[PDB]
C-alpha cells in the first residue's frame, strides 16, 4: 500500500475553470469572454506590478552603490528594515579587485567557519576573475603578492537579528586585524530588521566605537513613505478604470489587513486585489458588460437580476414621487480615480508632500471626508476648495463593484482558523447536512463533536476515566446496540453485541479513537511520558 | 580641521593639543580605565568639534576654550513592528514577568450569570523586582489570552479579537526576529505542547514599545 | 547623602572591562577545554549565556568581598562598603 | 430588572413571559427547564430568562425578520419597556453573555435544525459560506421575494 | 463549575486550584478492557456506517468547489485545506481524478507527487530526489555549491531562477497530506516546500490538521506559500493516519 509509504509518484489516466452563471443559463461564449476579460485585466495589472518591482530593486541597488562608493576603519552601512533579498553588485575598479562576501546565520556557527567561507569565496572569486592556499587572513595579507592588485571586500551580513552576536563581534574584531595592510579596504553591510539600538545593546562598547568611525544608516523598508504601495494601488485603479468600482469597505479592509503586516506589505496588497478580481470575474454575470462590445447579448435573466438594485430602487422611487436604460449608462467614466490622481500629483509636486497613503486618501474620498483627511498637513487650507470633490452616485454601480460583504475575502485569505475549527466542533449542524443508520444519526452526535462539548465544559485537567464515564452517559445504550445488530453479515460483531458489556466496549472504542484524534489535533495533552490517566486541555474556544 | 579653522578665522599648537588630551583623560579616565585604545577613540571622536570652538579669543585662554567646549566633556557619546506584533510582545513580557495564578485578578472584567469569585490578588507584594532576573517560560494559549485581554476593541460586531492567521504569522515573525525565544534553538518544532516560550527584550525596549502604542505597562508592575 | 553617578550606558563599558580582566566570569562556565576534540565540540554549540541580553547574564566573582577588604587601603573612598 | 440580584421565580411567570413573544409550548418548557437546571447556582434569574426568551424568539421568528427588518426592533423594544430599563445595551449584552452557555447544548442544536436558522441563514447558505465559495450570495442586492412584494406595493 | 466558558476569562477561570479531597483519582484501570482487533472491528463498522449519508451528501456539496480550486491554482495560489476530519481522500480525488487531466487538457497527463506527512519517515531529501527525477533540473556548478551548503536548497533556488523565465504550464502537482505532520513541520522541510511553492510551474495542494498550524509560517514563508485557505470539515475518521500512533496505550 502506497499510503504506508513516505512518498510516491502517480501517473493518472486522461477547458477553462470558469463556470456557467445565471442559475446555469449563461451562454457558453459569455463564459469564454469573461475568461478573456479576466486574462487581459490581470495581465494589464501585473505588467505594471512587475515593472514597479524592477524599479524598486534598481533604485535600491543604486542607493546602496552610492552609499558604498560615496582611512584605517570599516565602511559600515546599516540597512534598516531589510529582508536580505537585495542583490548587491559592485563596481569594476581599474587595477583593483572588488569582492562581495555574503554571510547568513546558518553559515555562521562560529568564527572559524565564517572566516573559512569568506576566504574560500575570496580566493574562488579572485582566481575566477584573474596553487592552493590556506583559507585564513594571511590570504588577505599576501593578496597583492599573488594577484598583483589591491583588494576591496564588501561583507553583506544577512539576518543579523538571527545571528549570534558574540560570534559576529569576534568576527568583526578578527577583521580589524586586516587594517594593518596597505592594500586592503573593508566595507560591512548589516541588514537590520528591528532597529539599531537593539543591536548596539548586543555588541561590545569597543565594537561600537570601532563601527562609529565611518558608518551610514539607511532606512529602506517596503513600507517606507508609501511610495511603492501607492504605485501598485494606482496601477490597479488604472486597470479597473472605467469598468469597475471600489467600495469604501473594501478599501478599509485593504488598510486594515495591510496594517497587520510590516515586512511584506506589497505582496499582500497584490494578493488581495488579485483575489478580488478573481472573485468578481468568477461570480458576476455582468462581467461581460464591462466593455461596450457586449451590449447585444442581454436576456430576461439579466433584466431580472439587474432590476434588484438599491440604486435602481431609489431611482424609480424618485421617478415615481429597461434594457435601453441599462445600456445608456455605460458611457460614464466615474472620475473619482482621476481626481485622486490629480490630488496625489498636486500634493507630490506643488506642495512637496510625499508622506501620504493613496489607499487612505481613496478611502476618505469614497466616504466624503477628504478635507478631514487633508487637515493633518495644515498646508491645504488655501486649496481645499480646489482639491475637494463631491462623491457622484452612479446608477447600477452595485453590479460593477469590488466589495466584501459576504466574508469571502476574510474566509479565503485571513480566516479565523482555530476559531473555525472550534466552531465546527462545537456546532456541527452547520457542517453535517440534515436528512441504515438514520435512526442513530438523529439521536447520536458525531463522536468528535460530542466529545468536544464535554471537553468545553470540563476543567483544565480532566480525569480520563471520568471523561469516559460522562461520554458513556451521553450515549443511548439501546439504539447503539440495535444499529450494531442491524447488520447480520458480521459474525464477530453479532457475537460481541450479545455480550452484556457491549455498550461500554463500543463507547470505549469510539471514545479512545476520538481521544487520540484530539491528541493529533492538539486539543489535549498527557501529563506524563508513561501514564495515560490525566489530560490537560490546551485549547479554549473564542481565543 | 585645526589648520583650516586657523586660516578661516608651533609650541602653542602643541599646548592646545596636550591640553585637549589632558582634558579628555581627566573627563573620561573613570569611563575608560587605563585603556589606551578607548582614550584614542574618544580623542579621535572629540577633536574636530573641540577644534570648531577655537577662536582668536579662545586660542590663548584655555579655560575659556574649556567653557565653550564643555558639552563634550560631560557625556561620552560613543554610540551610533505592527499593532498586533507590539501587543504580542507586550503580552509576552507580561507572561514572562508575572505569575500565571494572579492572571484572573487583573484582566478579568466580564460579568457573571453563574455564581463565582475571581482571584483576590497578591496579599502582600514581594520586594525582588522580577524584571532584574531572567524571564519565565509560558505556553501559547496563556499568551493568546493575555494578548486578547489587553488588545483594543451591536450583536454581530465581534468585540474581542480572535487569534486568526495574522496573529500566528506575527508570532512566528517575532520568533524569527529573536524578540521571542524558546528553550529549543535548533530543530525546534513549534507545534509540540512541550515547547515553552519566553520574551527576550530588555525592560527599556518593551517600555519604548508600550509607549509607542500608548499602552501603560508600568501600571502592571506597580 | 552623607561623586558623579554614571548611567547604565556608560557602566556597560566598565562591566565589559571587568569581564575582560578576569574579575567576573560566566556562571558554571567550563572555560578552556582540555583537548582539541572537546574544544571542537564546544565551538559547534550555541550557549544559552550568549543569546540573552548582557544585563541578564549570570556572573560569579573571581575575588570575594573579604579579599577586597583585605588589600584595598583603609583611606580609600569606597573602603567602608567592603564590610556589608 | 437586570441589576437587582437573588430572586426566586415560579413556572407561571416564565410561561407568561413566553406568551408575550408567542412561542410554542415545547420551547416554553425548554426555557422552563433551562432556568430550572441552573437555579441554585445563579445570581440573577431575570438575565437568564431574558436571554433564553430572546434567543428563542430570534430563531422562531427568523422568516418574519427576513421579510421585515423592523421585527428585530419590535422584540428588543418590547422587553426594554418590560424590564424597566432605559438604555438598550443591557439586553444585547445579556443575550451575548448567555449565548455562550446555551450554544453547546443538544436541544438548542435541535431547535436550530428544526427551524433552519443557524444564526441567520439556512444550511445551503452556511455550508457555502464556510467552504469559502465565490458563488455564495452577498448582501448587495435585494432578494427575489423582497422585489416581488415591492412590486406588489407599487402596483 | 465556571461562570465563564470560552473567552480569556474562561481560560483564567478554569485554571482554579482544586483540593486534594476533590481530585477524583479514578484511573483507567477500572475501565472495560478490550482486545486489539475488536477495536479495529468496531471502528470499521462505526466509521463505515455511522453518519455516512450526511458525509456523502457533504462531499457532494464540496465537490462543486473543484473549478474554483483549479482557478486558484492556475492563478498562482497554493491551496491549504483544513477542517475537522481526514482530508486524504478529498485531496487524492481532487488532484488525481479532476485537476491533473483538466490541467493537461487546458495546456494542450501531469505527474502527481504525493507526500504522506503523517508518516514520521517522510524525509525531504528522498522527496527532493523524486522532484529531481520528475523535473530534471540543471545540476549545480561548483561555484553554486558554495562551501558545505545545503545542496537541496541551493538547487531549488537555482530552479526558481530557471523557472522564472519558462511558460506558466503546470508540469508537477505536489500533494502534501498533513503539512503540519511530525517530520514535515520541521523548519528545513517547510523552507524546502515554501521555496518549491515559489515556482509557478508546481501546483501545491497541502492540508493541515493541528489547530496551531499557522504558527509554522512567518512573513517570508507565508509570502512564499501564497495560501488560499479552505475549510473542509467532513468528520472523516482518519483511518490511515491513525496507523502511526497506538490506541492501546
Phi and psi (nearest 5°) for A314? -70, -35
- Residue C56 CA from chain centroid, whole number: 12
**Under 8 Å CB-to-CB from A330, ≥6 apart: which residues?**
A289, A292, A295
Alpha-carbon gap, residue A116 to A236, rounded angstroms: 49
In DSSP terms, A77 is beta-bridged to A189, A216
Q: Is residue E206 part of a domain?
A: yes
CA-based nearest distance E82→chain A, Å: 8
Q: Are B177 and A161 in contact (CB under 8 A)?
A: yes
C-alpha cell at E240: 490511515
Contact D38 B115 (CB under 8 A): no
What secondary structure does DSSP assign to D5-23, as a single string? Answer: ------HHHHHHHHHHHT-
- Residue B87 CA from chain centroid, whole number: 16
Q: Are A224 and A81 in contact (CB under 8 A)?
A: yes
Instruction: Write the CA distances from A3 to A400, C30, E114, E217, integer angstroms.
Output: 48, 50, 9, 27
β-pairing, A150-157 with A184-192?
parallel
Alpha-carbon gap, residue A452 to A514, rounded angstroms: 9
CA-based nearest distance B170→chain A, Å: 8
Contact B164 A417 (CB under 8 A): yes
C-alpha cell at B181: 525565544
Alpha-carbon gap, residue B132 to A190, rounded angstroms: 30
Instruction: Write the CA distances from A393 to A222, A358, A396, A398, E157, integer angstroms.
Output: 35, 21, 10, 11, 50
Q: Hey, is E228 helix, strand or coil? A: strand
Alpha-carbon gap, residue E100 to E70, rounded angstroms: 10
Instruction: Write the CA distances from B39 to A212, A453, B36, B62, B186, integer angstroms.
Output: 14, 71, 5, 21, 41
Phi and psi (nearest 5°) for A156? -115, 100
Of B33, B76, B134, the CB nearest to C10: B76
**Under 8 Å CB-to-CB from E121, ≥6 apart: which residues?**
A6, E183
Q: Are A277 and A38 in contact (CB under 8 A)?
A: yes
Helix ranges (DSSP H) in chain E: 8-14, 36-48, 52-62, 66-74, 88-92, 100-106, 124-135, 151-163, 187-198, 219-225
Contact E111 A517 (CB under 8 A): no
CA-based nearest distance E179→chain B, Å: 12
Q: Are A402 and A276 in contact (CB under 8 A)?
A: yes
* Nearest residue on chain C to B185, alpha-carbon basis: C46
* Nearest residue on chain A to D112, alpha-carbon basis: A429
Q: Answer whether E214 touches B (CB < 8 Å).
A: yes
Question: B70: part of which helix (H) or strand (E)?
Answer: none
C-alpha cell at D35: 432556568
Angle in degrees, CA A443, A445, A451, rounded to 5: 135
Of B41, B82, B139, the CB nearest to A209: B41
Alpha-carbon gap, residue A206 to C17, rounded angstroms: 10
* Nearest residue on chain E to D97, alpha-carbon basis: E4
Q: Identify the burial level of A79 via C-beta atoms within 10 angstroms of its C-beta, where 0-12 means exposed, 13-18 middle and 19 or more buried.
A: buried
**Under 8 Å CB-to-CB from B199, ≥6 apart: which residues?**
B89, B92, B93, B95, B96, B135, B179, B180, B181, B206
Chain B residues in contact with chain D using a Cβ-Cβ cutoff of 8 Å: 110-115, 154-155
Of A164, A201, A206, the CB nearest to C51: A164
Tallying the residues shown for chain E, one arrives at 249
Alpha-carbon gap, residue E222 to B147, rounded angstroms: 22
Q: Identify the burial level of B55 via C-beta atoms within 10 angstroms of its C-beta, where 0-12 means exposed, 13-18 middle and 19 or more buried.
A: exposed
Q: In E, which residues are within 8 Å of A266 by CB distance?
A: none
Contacts B–D by Cβ distance under 8 A: 24
Q: Hey, is A466 helix, strand or coil? A: helix
Angle in degrees, CA C11, C16, C21, rounded to 5: 125
Tallying the residues shown for chain B, one arrives at 222
Question: A440: part of which helix (H) or strand (E)?
Answer: helix A438-443
Alpha-carbon gap, residue A207 to A218, rounded angstroms: 20
Alpha-carbon gap, residue E239 to E86, rounded angstroms: 8
C-beta atoms surrounding E22 within 10 Å: 6
Q: Answer whether B113 touches E (CB < 8 Å).
A: yes
| Positive/negative CA dihedral, A399, A400, A404, A407 | positive
Alpha-carbon gap, residue A67 to A58, rounded angstroms: 14
Alpha-carbon gap, residue E172 to E134, rounded angstroms: 8
β-pairing, E172-177 with E112-116?
parallel
Alpha-carbon gap, residue A447 to A34, rounded angstroms: 45
Q: What are chain E's partners, defined as 3 or more CB pairs within 8 angstroms?
A: A, B, D
> Which residue shows C-alpha cell 553588485?
A89
Alpha-carbon gap, residue E68 to A448, rounded angstroms: 29
Q: Are E114 and E92 in contact (CB under 8 A)?
A: yes
Contact C50 A109 (CB under 8 A): no
* Nearest residue on chain C to B186, alpha-carbon basis: C46
Q: Are B79 and B42 in contact (CB under 8 A)?
A: no
- Give the residue from A77, A102, A101 showing the smallest Cα distance to A158: A102
- Give the residue from A228, A269, A275 showing the smallest Cα distance to A51: A228
Contact B168 E180 (CB under 8 A): no
β-pairing, A245-246 with A534-537?
unpaired
Q: Are B201 and B89 in contact (CB under 8 A)?
A: yes
What secondary structure does DSSP assign to D56-112, as a single string? Answer: HHHHHTHHHHHH-THHHHHHHTTTTTTTT--SSHHHHHHHHHHHTTTTTSHHHHHHH
Alpha-carbon gap, residue A395 to A382, rounded angstroms: 34
Q: How many CA atoms lie within 13 A of B53 on its CB side?
A: 17
Tallying the residues shown for chain D, one arrives at 155
Phi and psi (nearest 5°) for E82? -145, 175
According to DSSP, residue E114 is labeled: E
Q: Are E87 and E81 in contact (CB under 8 A)?
A: yes
Q: Is residue E33 part of a domain?
A: no
Q: Answer whether E9 touches B (CB < 8 Å).
A: yes
> Which residue shows C-alpha cell 511610495?
A227
For chain B positions 19-48, those within 8 Å of chain A (CB to CB) are 37-38, 41, 44-45
According to DSSP, residue D42 is labeled: B
* Nearest residue on chain E to A532, alpha-carbon basis: E249
Q: Identify the burial level of A361 via C-beta atoms within 10 angstroms of its C-beta, where 0-12 means exposed, 13-18 middle and 19 or more buried.
A: buried
Q: Are A122 and A181 in contact (CB under 8 A)?
A: no
Chains E and B touch (3+ CB pairs under 8 A): yes
Q: Hey, is E211 helix, strand or coil? A: coil
Pick among D4, D97, D103 to test the B interface (most B CBs inside 10 A): D97
Phi and psi (nearest 5°) for E86? -75, 145
Of A193, A198, A209, the CB nearest to B38: A209
> Which residue shows C-alpha cell 532606512?
A219
Phi and psi (nearest 5°) for A309? -110, 135
Q: Are B20 and B50 in contact (CB under 8 A)?
A: yes
Contact D138 A405 (CB under 8 A): yes
* Nearest residue on chain B to D37, alpha-carbon basis: B114
Alpha-carbon gap, residue A409 to E86, rounded angstroms: 25
According to DSSP, residue A529 is labeled: S
**Under 8 Å CB-to-CB from D20, ≥6 apart: which residues?**
D78, D82
Alpha-carbon gap, residue E100 to E94, rounded angstroms: 9
**Under 8 Å CB-to-CB from A270, ≥6 apart: which residues?**
A49, A232
C-alpha cell at A301: 435573466
Of A307, A320, A430, the CB nearest to D126: A430
Tallying the residues shown for chain C, one arrives at 84
Alpha-carbon gap, residue A372 to B190, rounded angstroms: 46
Q: Identify the burial level of A366 via C-beta atoms within 10 angstroms of its C-beta, where 0-12 means exposed, 13-18 middle and 19 or more buried.
A: buried
Q: What are chain A's partners, defined as 3 or more CB pairs within 8 angstroms?
A: B, C, D, E
Of B31, B35, B186, the CB nearest to C10: B31
According to DSSP, residue A24 is labeled: T
End-to-end CA distance of chain E: 30
Contacts A–D by Cβ distance under 8 A: 73
Contact A419 B162 (CB under 8 A): yes
Q: In C, which residues are within 8 Å of B32 by CB distance?
A: 13
Contact B172 E215 (CB under 8 A): yes
Domain ranges, residue E117: 51-249
Alpha-carbon gap, residue D46 to D52, rounded angstroms: 10
CA-based nearest distance B47→chain A, Å: 13
Alpha-carbon gap, residue A26 to A384, rounded angstroms: 48
Alpha-carbon gap, residue A54 to B121, rounded angstroms: 58
> Which residue shows C-alpha cell 520568533?
B175
Contact A429 D104 (CB under 8 A): no
Q: Is residue E7 part of a domain?
A: no
Sequence-ordered strand ranges (E) for chain C: 24-26, 59-61
* Nearest residue on chain A to C16, alpha-carbon basis: A204
Of B110, B169, B175, the CB nearest to E214: B169
The count of domains in chain E is 1
> Which residue shows C-alpha cell 560569579?
C60
Q: Is residue E30 part of a domain?
A: no
What secondary structure does DSSP assign to B122-155, as a single string? Answer: -SS--SS-GGGSPPPPB-HHHHHHHHHHSS----
Q: Is residue E3 part of a domain?
A: no
Pick among B109, B113, B154 to test the D interface (most D CBs inside 10 A): B113
Q: Identify the burial level of E60 via C-beta atoms within 10 angstroms of its C-beta, where 0-12 means exposed, 13-18 middle and 19 or more buried.
A: exposed
Q: Hey, is B189 helix, strand or coil? A: coil
C-alpha cell at A324: 435601453
Question: A120: part of which helix (H) or strand (E)?
Answer: helix A111-129
Contact B163 A418 (CB under 8 A): yes
Sequence-ordered strand ranges (E) for A14-80: 75-80
Contact E12 B108 (CB under 8 A): yes
Contact A433 E32 (CB under 8 A): no
Q: What are chain D's partners, defined as 3 or more CB pairs within 8 angstroms?
A: A, B, E
What secondary structure does DSSP assign to A362-428, as a single string? Answer: HHHHHHT-HHHHHTTTS--TTTHHHH-------TTGGGSEE--SSSHHHHHTS--HHHHHHHHHHH-
Helix ranges (DSSP H) in E65-215: 66-74, 88-92, 100-106, 124-135, 151-163, 187-198
Q: Are B85 and B170 in contact (CB under 8 A)?
A: yes
Q: What is the 3-state secondary structure (H, E, C) of E62-79?
A: HHHHHHHHHHHHHCCCEE
> Which residue shows C-alpha cell 569581564?
C19
Contact B145 A540 (CB under 8 A): yes
Q: Is residue E123 part of a domain?
A: yes
Phi and psi (nearest 5°) for E240? -70, -45
Pick among A104, A416, A525 to test the B interface (most B CBs inside 10 A): A416
Q: Are E117 and E178 in contact (CB under 8 A)?
A: yes
Alpha-carbon gap, residue D143 to D66, rounded angstroms: 10
Phi and psi (nearest 5°) for A48? -65, -40
Largest CA distance in chain A: 97
What secondary structure does DSSP assign to A481-527, as a single string? Answer: HHHHHS-TT-HHHHHHHTSTTHHHHHHHHHHHHHHHHHHHHTSEEES
C-beta atoms surrounding A170 within 10 Å: 16
Q: Is residue E8 part of a domain?
A: no
Q: In C, which residues are within 8 Å of A112 by CB distance?
A: 43
Q: Are E207 and E235 in contact (CB under 8 A)?
A: no
Q: In E, which residues are within 8 Å of A520 by CB distance?
A: 209-210, 238, 241, 245
CA-based nearest distance A27→chain B, Å: 39
* Nearest residue on chain C to A110, alpha-carbon basis: C43
- Give the residue from E30, E32, E25, E31 showing the smallest Cα distance to A463: E25
Q: Answer whether B208 touches C (CB < 8 Å).
A: no
Q: What are chain C's partners, defined as 3 or more CB pairs within 8 angstroms?
A: A, B
Helix ranges (DSSP H) in A284-369: 300-306, 310-320, 323-328, 336-349, 358-367
According to DSSP, residue E98 is labeled: I
Q: Is residue E192 part of a domain?
A: yes
- Give the residue from B193, B182, A520 showing the smallest Cα distance to E117: A520
Alpha-carbon gap, residue A19 to A32, rounded angstroms: 10
> Which residue shows C-alpha cell 474620498?
A365
Amino acid at each position: 500500500a502506497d499510503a504506508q509509504r513516505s512518498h510516491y509518484t502517480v501517473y493518472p489516466s486522461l477547458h477553462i475553470p470558469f463556470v456557467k452563471l445565471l442559475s446555469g443559463k449563461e451562454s457558453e461564449v459569455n463564459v469564454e469572454k469573461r475568461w478573456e476579460l479576466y486574462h487581459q485585466l490581470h495581465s494589464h495589472f501585473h505588467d505594471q506590478v512587475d515593472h514597479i518591482i524592477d524599479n524598486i530593486e534598481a533604485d535600491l541597488k543604486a542607493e546602496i552603490s552610492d552609499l558604498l562608493y560615496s582611512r584605517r576603519c570599516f565602511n559600515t552601512i546599516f540597512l534598516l528594515g531589510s529582508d536580505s533579498t537585495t542583490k548587491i553588485e559592485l563596481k569594476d575598479e581599474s587595477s583593483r579587485y572588488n569582492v562581495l562576501i555574503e554571510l547568513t546565520p546558518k553559515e555562521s556557527p562560529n568564527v572559524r567557519m565564517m572566516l573559512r567561507r569568506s576566504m574560500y569565496k575570496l580566493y574562488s572569486a579572485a582566481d575566477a576573475e584573474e596553487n592552493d592556499v590556506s583559507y585564513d587572513l594571511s590570504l588577505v595579507e599576501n593578496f597583492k603578492r599573488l594577484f598583483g592588485k589591491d583588494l576591496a571586500m564588501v561583507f553583506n551580513f544577512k539576518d543579523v537579528d538571527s545571528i549570534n552576536f558574540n560570534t559576529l563581534d569576534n568576527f568583526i574584531i578578527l577583521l580589524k586585524s586586516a587594517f594593518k595592510y596597505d592594500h586592503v579596504k573593508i566595507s560591512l553591510i548589516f541588514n537590520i530588521n528591528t532597529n539599531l539600538s537593539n543591536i548596539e545593546k548586543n555588541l561590545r562598547q569597543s565594537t561600537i566605537r570601532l563601527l562609529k568611525r565611518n558608518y551610514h544608516k539607511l532606512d529602506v523598508s517596503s513600507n517606507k513613505g508609501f511610495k511603492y504601495g501607492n504605485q501598485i494601488f494606482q496601477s490597479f485603479l488604472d486597470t479597473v478604470d472605467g469598468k469597475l468600482n471600489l467600495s469604501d469597505r473594501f478599501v478599509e479592509f485593504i488598510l486594515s489587513k495591510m496594517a497587520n503586516n510590516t515586512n511584506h506589505n506589497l505582496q499582500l496588497l497584490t494578493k488581495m486585489l488579485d483575489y478580488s478580481l478573481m472573485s468578481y470575474f468568477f461570480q458576476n454575470a455582468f462581467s461581460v458588460f464591462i466593455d461596450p462590445v457586449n451590449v447585444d447579448f442581454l436576456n430576461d435573466d439579466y433584466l431580472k437580476i439587474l432590476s434588484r438594485c438599491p440604486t435602481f430602487m431609489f431611482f424609480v422611487e424618485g421617478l415615481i414621487k429597461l434594457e435601453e436604460f441599462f445600456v445608456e449608462f455605460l458611457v460614464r467614466e466615474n472620475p473619482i480615480n482621476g481626481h485622486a490622481k490629480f490630488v496625489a500629483r498636486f500634493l507630490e509636486e506643488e506642495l512637496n508632500i510625499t508622506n501620504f497613503n493613496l489607499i487612505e486618501l481613496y478611502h476618505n474620498l469614497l466616504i466624503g471626508k477628504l478635507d478631514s483627511y487633508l487637515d493633518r498637513w495644515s498646508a491645504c487650507k488655501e486649496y481645499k476648495d480646489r482639491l475637494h470633490f463631491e462623491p457622484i452616485d452612479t446608477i447600477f454601480q452595485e453590479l460593477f463593484t469590488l466589495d466584501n460583504r459576504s466574508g469571502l475575502l476574510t474566509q479565503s485569505i485571513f480566516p479565523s482558523y482555530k476559531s473555525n475549527i472550534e466552531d465546527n466542533l462545537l456546532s456541527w449542524e452547520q457542517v453535517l447536512p440534515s436528512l441504515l443508520s438514520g435512526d442513530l444519526d438523529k439521536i447520536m452526535a458525531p463522536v468528535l463533536g460530542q466529545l468536544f462539548k464535554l471537553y468545553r465544559e470540563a476543567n483544565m485537567t480532566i480525569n480520563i476515566y471520568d471523561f469516559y464515564i460522562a461520554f458513556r452517559e451521553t450515549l443511548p445504550k439501546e439504539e447503539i446496540l440495535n444499529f450494531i445488530r442491524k447488520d447480520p453479515s458480521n459474525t464477530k460483531l453479532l457475537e460481541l453485541a450479545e455480550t452484556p458489556d457491549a455498550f461500554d466496549k463500543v463507547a470505549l472504542i469510539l471514545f479512545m479513537q476520538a481521544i487520540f484524534a484530539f491528541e493529533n489535533m492538539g486539543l489535549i495533552k498527557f501529563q506524563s511520558t508513561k501514564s495515560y490517566d490525566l489530560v490537560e486541555k490546551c485549547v479554549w474556544r473564542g481565543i | 580641521c585645526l589648520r583650516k579653522r586657523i586660516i578661516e578665522e608651533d609650541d602653542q599648537f602643541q599646548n592646545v593639543a596636550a591640553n585637549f588630551i589632558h582634558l579628555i583623560v581627566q573627563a573620561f579616565h573613570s569611563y575608560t580605565g587605563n585603556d589606551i585604545f578607548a582614550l584614542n577613540d574618544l580623542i579621535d571622536f572629540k577633536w574636530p568639534k573641540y577644534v570648531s570652538r577655537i577662536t582668536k579669543e579662545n586660542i590663548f585662554e584655555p579655560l575659556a576654550l574649556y567653557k565653550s567646549a564643555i558639552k563634550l566633556f560631560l557625556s561620552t557619546d560613543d554610540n551610533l513592528l505592527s499593532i498586533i506584533s507590539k501587543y504580542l510582545l507586550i503580552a509576552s513580557y507580561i507572561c514572562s514577568y508575572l505569575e500565571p495564578r494572579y492572571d484572573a485578578s487583573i484582566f478579568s472584567r466580564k460579568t457573571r450569570i453563574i455564581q463565582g469569585r475571581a482571584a483576590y490578588g497578591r496579599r502582600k507584594k514581594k520586594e525582588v523586582n522580577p524584571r532584574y532576573l531572567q524571564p519565565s517560560l509560558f505556553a501559547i494559549e496563556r499568551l493568546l489570552a493575555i494578548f486578547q485581554a489587553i488588545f483594543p476593541i451591536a450583536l454581530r460586531e465581534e468585540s474581542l479579537m480572535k487569534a486568526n492567521i495574522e496573529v500566528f504569522q506575527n508570532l512566528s515573525e517575532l520568533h524569527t526576529l529573536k524578540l521571542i525565544a524558546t528553550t529549543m534553538n535548533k530543530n525546534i518544532d513549534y507545534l509540540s505542547p512541550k515547547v515553552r516560550w519566553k520574551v527576550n527584550v530588555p525592560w527599556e525596549i518593551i517600555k519604548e514599545i508600550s509607549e509607542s502604542v500608548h499602552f501603560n505597562i508600568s501600571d502592571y508592575f506597580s | 547623602s552623607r561623586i558623579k553617578l554614571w548611567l547604565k550606558k556608560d557602566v556597560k563599558n566598565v562591566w565589559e572591562n571587568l569581564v575582560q580582566l578576569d574579575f567576573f566570569t560566566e556562571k558554571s562556565a567550563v572555560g578552556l577545554r582540555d583537548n582539541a576534540t572537546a574544544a571542537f565540540y564546544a565551538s559547534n554549540y550555541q550557549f544559552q549565556g550568549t543569546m540573552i541580553p548582557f544585563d541578564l547574564r549570570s556572573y560569579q566573582m573571581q575575588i570575594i568581598l573579604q579579599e577586597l577588604r583585605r588589600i584595598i587601603p583603609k583611606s580609600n573612598m569606597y573602603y567602608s562598603w567592603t564590610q556589608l | 430588572l437586570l441589576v437587582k440580584k437573588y430572586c426566586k421565580m415560579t413556572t407561571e411567570e416564565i410561561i407568561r413571559l413566553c406568551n408575550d413573544f408567542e412561542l410554542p409550548r415545547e420551547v416554553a418548557y425548554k426555557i422552563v427547564d433551562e432556568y430550572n437546571i441552573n437555579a441554585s447556582r445563579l445570581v440573577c434569574p431575570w438575565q437568564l430568562v431574558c436571554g433564553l426568551v430572546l434567543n428563542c424568539t430570534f430563531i422562531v421568528f427568523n422568516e418574519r425578520r427576513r421579510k421585515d427588518p423592523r421585527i428585530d426592533h419590535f422584540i428588543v423594544s418590547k422587553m426594554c419597556s418590560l424590564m424597566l430599563t432605559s438604555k438598550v445595551d443591557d439586553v444585547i449584552e445579556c443575550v451575548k453573555l448567555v449565548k455562550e452557555l446555551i450554544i453547546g447544548e443538544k436541544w438548542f442544536r435541535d431547535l436550530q435544525i428544526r427551524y433552519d436558522d443557524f444564526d441567520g441563514i439556512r444550511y445551503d447558505e452556511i455550508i457555502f459560506r464556510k467552504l469559502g465559495s465565490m458563488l455564495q450570495t452577498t448582501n448587495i442586492l435585494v432578494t427575489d421575494d423582497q422585489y416581488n412584494i415591492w412590486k406588489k406595493r407599487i402596483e | 463549575a465556571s461562570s465563564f466558558l470560552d473567552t480569556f476569562e474562561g481560560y483564567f477561570d478554569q485554571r482554579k486550584i482544586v483540593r486534594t479531597n476533590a481530585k477524583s483519582r479514578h484511573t483507567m484501570s477500572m475501565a472495560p478492557d478490550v482486545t486489539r482487533e475488536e477495536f479495529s472491528l468496531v471502528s470499521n463498522f462505526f466509521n463505515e456506517n455511522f453518519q455516512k449519508r450526511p458525509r456523502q451528501k457533504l462531499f457532494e456539496i464540496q465537490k462543486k468547489m473543484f473549478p474554483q480550486y483549479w482557478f486558484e491554482l492556475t492563478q498562482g495560489f497554493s491551496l491549504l485545506f483544513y477542517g475537522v476530519g481526514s482530508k486524504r481522500n478529498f485531496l487524492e480525488e481532487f488532484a488525481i481524478d479532476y485537476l491533473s487531466p483538466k490541467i493537461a487538457y487546458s495546456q494542450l497527463s501531469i505527474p502527481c507527487l504525493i507526500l504522506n506527512g503523517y508518516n514520521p519517515s517522510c524525509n525531504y531529501r528522498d522527496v527532493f530526489k523524486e522532484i529531481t527525477d520528475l523535473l530534471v533540473p540543471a545540476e549545480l556548478t561548483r561555484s553554486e555549491t558554495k562551501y558545505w551548503g545545503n545542496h537541496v536548497i541551493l538547487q531549488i533556488q537555482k530552479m526558481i531562477d530557471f523557472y522564472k523565465n519558462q511558460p506558466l504550464d503546470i508540469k508537477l502537482i505536489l500533494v502534501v497530506h498533513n503539512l503540519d505532520g511530525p517530520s514535515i513541520r520541521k523548519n528545513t522541510f517547510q523552507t524546502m516546500l515554501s521555496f518549491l511553492s515559489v515556482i509557478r510551474q508546481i501546483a501545491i495542494v497541502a492540508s493541515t490538521d493541528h489547530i496551531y498550524a499557522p504558527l509554522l509560517w512567518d512573513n517570508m514563508k507565508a509570502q512564499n506559500y501564497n495560501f488560499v485557505f479552505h475549510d473542509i470539515s467532513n468528520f472523516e475518521p482518519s483511518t490511515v493516519e491513525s496507523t502511526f500512533q497506538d490506541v492501546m496505550k
